[PDB]
Design a protein around this ligand. Structure first.
Ligand SMILES: O=C1COc2ccc(C3=C(c4ccc(F)cc4F)C(=O)OC3)cc2N1
Length: 258
């Protein structure tokens, strides 16, 4: 809080990079075949543990604490699949140059796994998002800021408890992205073009993530019949999220209008 301390303290993007979650293992069971039942159960277990890290992350995310508890909860529950998908795309980009879907070091999907998981087309759509990371040569700086924008990209139909505090936080992070692209237009030429590409990429997540969620809601509802395991963390999120999304109580915020 000191004057000197404030002027010198790591910038907001440096803070985001510092609080980026550690590596999470899926705990892949080599004794089980790669069937939908086992792959999806493994993805769900993995995602539960990643979501625990996401909550820890959100806890020290600057600005997030300034929202009401219920809005914080609401935002994590609405954006969870966007956050996991984006982080997946990043890992896939960094570890495999977006050739494969790197869910964890012990769970990397090639095309065969994509089929086996019963979400071939969804995995291919995500892989295609990851290919954009290669085209753009997305940077760690862009990634971290964009991930925050994803946390802040889906809200209830009639908005949040503290809509103004949310909008302030969202604007603040959009501004960080603006600053970043002004400094570093990277391979898009002009800073405005960089911002356009990055925000279009974010908008392009919505339909894929919505499709991912529909499958997740289906397997959740039919969990016992399908033998698809969900951990408590996902049970909690999906039990709250599913009726809201399915009843239209959901509003995606697009950077660019349809
Ligand atoms: O039971 C089900 C079926 O619907 C699901 C849909 C998605 C997931 C998760 C993803 C994921 C994200 C992007 C993709 F392209 C493929 C993905 F699998 C992730 O990264 O974490 C969980 C898990 C289930 N679980």
């Amino acid at each position: 809080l000191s004057t000197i301390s404030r002027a010198l303290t790591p910038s907001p993007v440096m803070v985001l990079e510092n609080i980026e979650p550690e590596i999470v293992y899926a705990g892949y069971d080599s004794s089980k075949p790669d069937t939908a039942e086992n792959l999806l159960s493994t993805l769900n277990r993995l995602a539960g543990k990643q979501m625990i890290q996401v909550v820890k992350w959100a806890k020290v995310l600057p600005g997030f604490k300034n929202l009401p508890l219920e809005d914080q909860i609401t935002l994590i529950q609405y954006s969870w699949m966007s956050l996991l998908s984006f982080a997946l795309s990043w890992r896939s980009y960094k570890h495999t140059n977006s050739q494969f879907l790197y869910f964890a070091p012990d769970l990397v999907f090639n095309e065969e796994k994509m089929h086996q998981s019963a979400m071939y087309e969804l995995c291919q759509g995500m892989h295609q998002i990851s290919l954009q990371f290669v085209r753009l040569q997305l940077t760690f700086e862009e990634y971290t800021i964009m991930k925050v924008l994803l946390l802040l990209s889906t809200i209830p139909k009639d908005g949040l408890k503290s809509q103004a505090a949310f909008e302030e936080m969202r604007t603040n992070y959009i501004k960080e992205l603006r600053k970043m692209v002004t400094k570093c237009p990277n391979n898009s030429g002009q800073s405005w073009q960089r911002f356009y590409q990055l925000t279009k990429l974010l908008d392009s997540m919505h339909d894929l993530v919505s499709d991912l969620l529909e499958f997740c809601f289906y397997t959740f509802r039919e969990s016992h019949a399908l033998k698809v395991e969900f951990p408590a963390m996902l049970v909690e999120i999906i039990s709250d999220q599913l009726p809201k999304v399915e009843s239209g109580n959901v509003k995606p915020l697009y950077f660019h209008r349809k």
